[PDB]
Amino acid sequence: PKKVLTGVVVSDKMQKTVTVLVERQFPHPLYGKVIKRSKKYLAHDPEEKYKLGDVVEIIESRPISKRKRFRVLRLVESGRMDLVEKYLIRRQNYQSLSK
């Protein structure tokens, strides 16, 4: 109840807010192979104490804004830009797709 999950911060540009990226894995319905999948969450940070590259725990909470519906609960471990880079690079490549 009041779901809670862990993920890395990938954005802090917003006022009193951070974007958290959370992975999750599970067996493919027909092919079994444990496949990964993830999703960004806008979290409420009423002090911007949490910063880029921070791994955290966000909890289901009362609606703060249009997209914000989770407050950051606690810092899991600081500094992990390596993960942020993966997500940023994943983005970079999108440029190399259009026409």
Partner RNA sequence: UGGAGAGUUUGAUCCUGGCUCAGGGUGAACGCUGGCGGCGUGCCUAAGACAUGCAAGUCGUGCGGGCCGCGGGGUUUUACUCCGUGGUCAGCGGCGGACGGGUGAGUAACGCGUGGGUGACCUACCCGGAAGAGGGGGACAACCCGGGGAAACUCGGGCUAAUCCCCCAUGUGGACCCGCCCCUUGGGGUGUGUCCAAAGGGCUUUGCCCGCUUCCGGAUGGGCCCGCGUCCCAUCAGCUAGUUGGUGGGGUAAUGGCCCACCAAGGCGACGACGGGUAGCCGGUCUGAGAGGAUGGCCGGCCACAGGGGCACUGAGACACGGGCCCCACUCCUACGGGAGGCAGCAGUUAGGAAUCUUCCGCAAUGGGCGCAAGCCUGACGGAGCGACGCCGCUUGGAGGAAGAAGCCCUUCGGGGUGUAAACUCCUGAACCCGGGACGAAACCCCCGAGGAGGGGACUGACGGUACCGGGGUAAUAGCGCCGGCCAACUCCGUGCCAGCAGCCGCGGUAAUACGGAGGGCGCGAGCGUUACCCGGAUUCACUGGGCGUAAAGGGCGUGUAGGCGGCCUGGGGCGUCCCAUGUG
Partner RNA sequence: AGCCUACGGGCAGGCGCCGAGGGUAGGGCCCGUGACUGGGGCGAAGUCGUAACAAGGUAGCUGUACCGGAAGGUGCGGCUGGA
Q: Which residues bind RNA (CB under 7 A)?
A: 1-3, 11, 13-17, 19, 23-27, 29-34, 36-42, 44, 46, 60-69, 71, 86, 89-91, 93-95, 97-99
* Structure token digits, residue 97: 């797709």
When CB distances are held under 5 to 8 angstroms depending on the partner's kind, the choice from RNA, Mg ion, none that residue 60 binds is RNA
Asked if 89 touches Mg ion (CB under 5 A), the answer is: no
**What is the separation of C-alpha 49 from the centre of its chain, rounded to a whole number of angstroms?**
16
Please report, as ranges, the residues that interact with Mg ion according to CB under 5 A: 39, 65-66, 96-99
